[PDB]
Amino acid sequence: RTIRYGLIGAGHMAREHVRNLALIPGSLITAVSDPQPSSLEETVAEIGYEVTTFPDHRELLVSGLVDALVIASPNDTHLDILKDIFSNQMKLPVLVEKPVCTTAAQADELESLAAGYSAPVWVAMEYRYMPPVQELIQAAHGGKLGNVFMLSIVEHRFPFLHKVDAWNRFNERTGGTLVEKCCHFFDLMRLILQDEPTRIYASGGHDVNHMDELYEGRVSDMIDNAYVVVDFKSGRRAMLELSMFAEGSKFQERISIVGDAAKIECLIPVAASHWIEGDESEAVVEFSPRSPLGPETHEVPVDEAVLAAGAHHGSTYYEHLGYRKAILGEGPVEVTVADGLQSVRMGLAAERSIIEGRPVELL
Amino acid sequence: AVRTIRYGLIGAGHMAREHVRNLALIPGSLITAVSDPQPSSLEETVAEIGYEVTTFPDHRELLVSGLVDALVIASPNDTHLDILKDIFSNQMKLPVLVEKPVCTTAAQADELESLAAGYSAPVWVAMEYRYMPPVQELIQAAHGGKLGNVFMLSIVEHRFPFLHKVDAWNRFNERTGGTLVEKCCHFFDLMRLILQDEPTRIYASGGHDVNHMDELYEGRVSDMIDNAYVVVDFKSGRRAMLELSMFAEGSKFQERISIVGDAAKIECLIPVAASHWIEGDESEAVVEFSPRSPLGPETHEVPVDEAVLAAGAHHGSTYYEHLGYRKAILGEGPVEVTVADGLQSVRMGLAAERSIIEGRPVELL
Numbered sequence A: 001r002t003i004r005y006g007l008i009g010a011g012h013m014a015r016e017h018v019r020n021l022a023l024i025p026g027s028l029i030t031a032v033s034d035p036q037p038s039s040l041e042e043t044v045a046e047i048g049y050e051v052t053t054f055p056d057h058r059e060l061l062v063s064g065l066v067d068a069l070v071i072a073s074p075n076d077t078h079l080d081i082l083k084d085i086f087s088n089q090m091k092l093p094v095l096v097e098k099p100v101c102t103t104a105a106q107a108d109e110l111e112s113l114a115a116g117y118s119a120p121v122w123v124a125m126e127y128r129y130m131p132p133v134q135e136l137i138q139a140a141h142g143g144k145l146g147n148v149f150m151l152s153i154v155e156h157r158f159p160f161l162h163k164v165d166a167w168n169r170f171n172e173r174t175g176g177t178l179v180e181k182c183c184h185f186f187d188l189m190r191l192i193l194q195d196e197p198t199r200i201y202a203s204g205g206h207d208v209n210h211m212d213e214l215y216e217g218r219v220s221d222m223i224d225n226a227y228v229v230v231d232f233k234s235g236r237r238a239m240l241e242l243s244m245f246a247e248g249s250k251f252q253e254r255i256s257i258v259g260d261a262a263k264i265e266c267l268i269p270v271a272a273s274h275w276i277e278g279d280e281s282e283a284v285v286e287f288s289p290r291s292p293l294g295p296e297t298h299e300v301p302v303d304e305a306v307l308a309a310g311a312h313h314g315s316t317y318y319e320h321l322g323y324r325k326a327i328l329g330e331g332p333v334e335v336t337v338a339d340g341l342q343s344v345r346m347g348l349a350a351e352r353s354i355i356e357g358r359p360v361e362l363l
Numbered sequence B: 001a002v003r004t005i006r007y008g009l010i011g012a013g014h015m016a017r018e019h020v021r022n023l024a025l026i027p028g029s030l031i032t033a034v035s036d037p038q039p040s041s042l043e044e045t046v047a048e049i050g051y052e053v054t055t056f057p058d059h060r061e062l063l064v065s066g067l068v069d070a071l072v073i074a075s076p077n078d079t080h081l082d083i084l085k086d087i088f089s090n091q092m093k094l095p096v097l098v099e100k101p102v103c104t105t106a107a108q109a110d111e112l113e114s115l116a117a118g119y120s121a122p123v124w125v126a127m128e129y130r131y132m133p134p135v136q137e138l139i140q141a142a143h144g145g146k147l148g149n150v151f152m153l154s155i156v157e158h159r160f161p162f163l164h165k166v167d168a169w170n171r172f173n174e175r176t177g178g179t180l181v182e183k184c185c186h187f188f189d190l191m192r193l194i195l196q197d198e199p200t201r202i203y204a205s206g207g208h209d210v211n212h213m214d215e216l217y218e219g220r221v222s223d224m225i226d227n228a229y230v231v232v233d234f235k236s237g238r239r240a241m242l243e244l245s246m247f248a249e250g251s252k253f254q255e256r257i258s259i260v261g262d263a264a265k266i267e268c269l270i271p272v273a274a275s276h277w278i279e280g281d282e283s284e285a286v287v288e289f290s291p292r293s294p295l296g297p298e299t300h301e302v303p304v305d306e307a308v309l310a311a312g313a314h315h316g317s318t319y320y321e322h323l324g325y326r327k328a329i330l331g332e333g334p335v336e337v338t339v340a341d342g343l344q345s346v347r348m349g350l351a352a353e354r355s356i357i358e359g360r361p362v363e364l365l
């Protein structure tokens, strides 16, 4: 059963989508849209076979060429493109890239519109499918840690990469760092702890990065490091640590979950495309029972092709298997617009916390 | 020539016995006097000393005994100020090593602050963690610029519930100052030390979620926190985060400290003390230096002298603390951990406890 995919936005992440679809039988890209032909040229080369291209998504939407959509355009364009999809005579499934939107007003508007749209809308927050992360989720959800109380997430990575039109350098286009980069983490918090946030507090700064990059004399206004503490309805708690100038760290992600029977932790290595050649490491998961003492540690292997197709530890592949099911009406949307909105509202509350030096309540 | 120092110990329990074992490694360290209102404690501690000393049920008799050149206080937290006041009113001007927390309440801190200013002999607050060999490496790297400008300091402690103590003194906030004072003053102090700056704002989320639920004390259950996340902002916009869990004793490494600067990151991992871990699964602490450019992390074990490590449960730190205190007693070095350091550490913990209760940040001066 073949699915005809249309890509709206044909840049870096789009090419990751391409390489992952290439690993899933019945995945045919038929249409790609991007206002920049140098992006289309690069992405079509990556596809490796002929597709129809369009400068504007609206022509793609009425092309008759597609069964399902993927949006990989800049964050602040997601709602506009979604609206055109929602108004289309053909109502198609959409995988829309993270952040689903970038402001509080966008979130409010998207919430009304998506509620009235009849086809699957999946927000492409894929980190839960990283095999190490899946192990932690199953351990937490399956009771192996006892009652869960704490979730720590540490991301230590390189500065935001250069992008088409330098779109990721200003809060006005990204929603802020804690939306652009940390929606994934706020979503993992809700997933792992199976609960809703009530309060968020963050300390953060723009302290290091992009100080030498000028746009009409102006520097990037985005955060490059933060600590965020999130309280939950049930009384569980989570903390996110982010540094966008800690690319020295062999393990880019550390996730720890502490319960009253055990702790579990994973370490996720820097993707091979950004690390030292040859010094390739697997992710590790450590299970640490309170009693009896005796931690268990294991490497978590990922299929070599799956890992090579993306920079997110094989997660994008699993994301597509799930989206495929949603497209064929054989499975649910696992990451919904509601999930995306919570993630964004959490990021937005964190950004406001940083500015105001007060915690921010969520309803 | 070993210079002999006559030490008086006030409080003769668990930590006192660690003090004893450490002094035993330092030539010229003679315990002459030990005070404790509980004879079972004196019996235990004298056996640990291994030679005869004069004992007193009350420190006030020890203070005027003429037997001592220097004091160590290892009594319960809420007694430290009272004992210090007796020392300050004595006309003997004896150096004191007073165990952390230096005090337990805001009113105690205000009072101690005025009184300590008028006392002319060394007062050292016994927050020893800086002398843990791996931690000293991180401090030197940070202070020496190997990380570039320092922005972030993460401290994670994953350990066992508070141990049972004499008179169960450590089960209520009223006696301990709260978990973030009793257990975390060490960490707030390391923050000030490493970042060389003062806190402006503290926010914490924490609870009493797991521990001591089956212990009753005149019908009451322990009111102390057993897990927390604390975020601390500093005048120079550096930031630190403390994560504590008192129910994560399965973790091989009880402490993790990471420091992130604009040139490099450094991290250390401190193993559970051998007296609390599995026999035979002994590991050393590890330090990893991670330069941003070029990529290439450097990892090494940080070995500790075997006798020093065996003498205490704080990775050799107590030994170095005593070498430092010895120097202060002899007028050959400064008090490295002052009453001001203790007060800041306590006030930070106190603010954190209040933050947890009130769900708001707390501003510090």
Ligand SMILES: NC(=O)c1ccc[n+]([C@@H]2O[C@H](COP(=O)([O-])OP(=O)(O)OC[C@H]3O[C@@H](n4cnc5c(N)ncnc54)[C@H](O)[C@@H]3O)[C@@H](O)[C@H]2O)c1
Residues within 6 Å of the ligand: A008, A009, A010, A011, A012, A013, A014, A033, A034, A035, A036, A039, A057, A072, A073, A074, A075, A077, A097, A098, A099, A124, A125, A126, A162, A163, A164, A165, A167, A180, A312
């Ligand atoms: N899920 C993940 O792990 C992950 C990783 C990286 C990026 N992303 C997301 O993917 C999206 C794209 O980021 P990127 O790194 O690929 O950026 P990029 O700059 O490489 O590519 C963006 C592309 O969008 C095109 N474009 C700009 N305006 C558009 C519009 N109005 N309609 C259609 N296309 C338009 C640009 O011409 C460019 O080709 C962002 O939302 C980003 O957050 C997700």
Ligand SMILES: NC(=O)c1ccc[n+]([C@@H]2O[C@H](COP(=O)([O-])OP(=O)(O)OC[C@H]3O[C@@H](n4cnc5c(N)ncnc54)[C@H](O)[C@@H]3O)[C@@H](O)[C@H]2O)c1
Residues within 6 Å of the ligand: B010, B011, B012, B013, B014, B015, B016, B035, B036, B037, B038, B041, B059, B074, B075, B076, B077, B079, B099, B100, B101, B126, B127, B128, B165, B166, B167, B169, B182, B314
């Ligand atoms: N790493 C460290 O720096 C560290 C570690 C453990 C304990 N401590 C500190 O050491 C102190 C004692 O803790 P511990 O674990 O030894 O407890 P413990 O209960 O084992 O010993 C405390 C002793 O103090 C005695 N005592 C009670 N009231 C007294 C008073 N008014 N004057 C004199 N002695 C009195 C008790 O009888 C008991 O023998 C506390 O301040 C604690 O915070 C520090």
